[PDB]
């Protein structure tokens, strides 16, 4: 039934946080969801320190999409470097009262953060939902 499959896919996108079981979008557009899904796969894989597969998928699924859109590939390639830096009593007293910090005894990537916000999951699921509704 239409509603059952729609609900299952929406839950897999929202409840779980994995792209697989999206094969419909993978093999049926024939009319921006494909590029968005591939970019989301790239970022999701690069969130873990895995690189080789990220390079392979970048060369395989995002290389043909260069003629139309070019800036998003630039942002992805920049993230490929900047991922290691963008993502993650006494001191509190000093910060709140004096705006000063003690040394530790040892003797503006807003765009990239926007590429890592979890709201991307919601907007991707929303785009899939809208396309699926308007196509059926």
């Amino acid at each position: 039934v239409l509603l059952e499959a729609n609900r299952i896919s929406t839950s897999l996108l929202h409840e779980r946080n994995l792209l697989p079981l999206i094969s419909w979008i993978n093999e049926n557009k024939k009319t921006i969801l494909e590029f968005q899904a591939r970019l989301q796969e790239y970022i999701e894989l690069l969130k873990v320190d895995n690189y080789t597969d990220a390079i392979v998928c970048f060369q395989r699924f995002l290389l043909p999409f260069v003629k139309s859109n070019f800036t998003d590939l630039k942002l992805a390639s920049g993230l490929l470097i900047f991922i290691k830096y963008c993502n993650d009593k006494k001191d509190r007293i000093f910060q709140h009262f004096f705006h000063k910090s003690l040394p530790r005894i040892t003797s503006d990537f807003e765009r990239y953060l926007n590429l890592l916000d979890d709201q991307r999951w919601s907007v991707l699921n929303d785009l899939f939902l809208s396309d699926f509704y308007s196509m059926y």
Binding site: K90, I93, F98
Partner: protein, 762 residues
Amino acid sequence: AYSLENLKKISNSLVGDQLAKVDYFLAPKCQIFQCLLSIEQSDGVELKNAKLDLLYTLLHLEPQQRDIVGTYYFDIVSAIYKSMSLASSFTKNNSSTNYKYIKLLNLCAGVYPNCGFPDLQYLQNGFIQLVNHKFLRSKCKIDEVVTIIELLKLFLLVDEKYQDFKMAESLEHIIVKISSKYLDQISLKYIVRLPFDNKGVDCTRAIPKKINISNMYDSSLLSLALLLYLRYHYMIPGDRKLRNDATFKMFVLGLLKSNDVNIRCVALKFLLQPYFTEDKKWEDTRTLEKILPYLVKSFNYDPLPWWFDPFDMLDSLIVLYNEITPMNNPVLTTLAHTNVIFCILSRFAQCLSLPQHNEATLKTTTKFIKICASFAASDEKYRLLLLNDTLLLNHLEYGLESHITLIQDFISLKDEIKETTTESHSMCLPPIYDHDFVAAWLLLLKSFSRSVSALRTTLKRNKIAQLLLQILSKTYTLTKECYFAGQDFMKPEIMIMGITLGSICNFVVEFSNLQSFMLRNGIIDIIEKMLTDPLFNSKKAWDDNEDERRIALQGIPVHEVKANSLWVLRHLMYNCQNEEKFQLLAKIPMNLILDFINDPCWAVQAQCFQLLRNLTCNSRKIVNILLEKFLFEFLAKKMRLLNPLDTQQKKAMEGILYIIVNLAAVNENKKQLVIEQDEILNIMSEILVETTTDSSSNGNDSNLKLACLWVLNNLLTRATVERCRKLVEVGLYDLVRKNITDESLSVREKARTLLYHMDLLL
């Protein structure tokens, strides 16, 4: 960590890379330091240069990298100060090594200034010898010139809180020997109304053409030499000094129009120092008129040297003409006639209302607030113009509330903070980040509070008074309970207290609405608490528990608070009945007031004497209390010691004279008592003799003359005739007769009516 081949490669593999730099501070590679900064008086001259280059490269970290590395960085810097033996042999090392070492020392002083450098005299001796021998004889080399430049830069930074003569001589010789190459570029044509080269008139409102210095080394040398010479030269006696010359003054005026920003700034500083330092120079408005345009134009150049600050100089000029000759401010008129006052006010309004602030914007706003307070110091025009906004008072209350909240948070968390911060920073704690901001707001409020119309129509709020009382109480309590933070955290709060008491002392005066409010909420109790503190009253003793507090707060200057406390008490008793008098005397007894009478600060003495005047002002009882509380020779000694040429001392003298006036009116017994004493009659005689021709002693003032005439008038049945005859014999009839010819109508009329009454009674 070995021969030059390794060090050169390491240095060439460490340029601009912060990662390897911060890696070298990790444990496996720290062994390089044991050889890097252990430099003996041997091992070639190439090895020393390589080691110094490596040290300079490693210590080049951006602030977040410094935070990452930690205290090992500052340990390295301290080892550079304390265990390097190159400063001692400055005259014997090679020139290039000296240059590299001075550059390293500059960086170290720029990154970690608190650490003490113990070897300044060696560098001063080396600098003096080097410049006096090599430079002035033109047998110099490139590295020596650059070394002199670096040494001047290093000497400029010192805080400073016989060799001075040698240094001043060397600096002046530098200045002359470099500037003499450019004097022939001065040009100025002018027209004077009644040949050439007479230079008869240089009040022509114009300044010569710009003077351009091609050589960059000459630019740097001239600028830094002028700055340091400005630092030293006033402590050097002699005649025909550089500052007083005319050709040099013209040279600097021409330099004002140059291209180098440092040149313009140092020219401004050299031209403006005499107003703050030299006396009577303030009556030279022509030079200010011809200078001010460039001081204003200096606000727009972006890269400014750290030793230049247009805000501070402009504020200092305004404060000078406010303090010395109010009701006429040539700076304020010159600025108001040419639209720049309005620009300053508009920029203040813009900065007050930014969407998001930080430290720099907070400091800019503080500066603007201070300058706006300077505008409204002695002119009702700007008071009303600023008050027409009806939004400043909200921000004033917001700032005061913020400081109160911060102080409350600190006092609540006292025990935990002391427990967790007593081993490392036992008595070294930074001050609260808000001190300057609230200080500026309090200055602005104090400036506003001088106009009675504003006190009666637009400042007639209760929130202001409540906030002032809260700040006073909280600051004094913070002094009482948290004396473990030392002087660095304590001095700003005592300054705040001194400012806020002075701001209060206007609200509490008569014909002001909020006097009843302040009396209801009990300012007298707070002042009574503050006046018995051994930290303030020096004629008391400390208990057995406060020793730590006393040693923690021994070297703090506290006299503004005492003067303003006595000021408030004076204003509380101005034109009041005996009920309020006896109430305040019930709270604060006479003993404290008499205890503040021998303070080593002149302002405290003045305020104590004025309060004594207002206390005995029309009171038959408090005069008896004061007479019992001691007898008269003290007043004569005070009037003999005090210098009438000083403003505060003159105020004290007038206070004592009017104390005598009030003393000589309670009863006939007091009249005879004050007539009997003979010395005071000698002081009156010495006061009255002074005239226009003889204006040396007591400055030929009129208020003192009126006070003495009032004393004589109050001195008036056969006993009265006897006193009249005694006054005639003592030499007063001739004095009052000769007073008829004075230059002020008041003393003439008082003298003629007194003389008529005296003759009529005689």
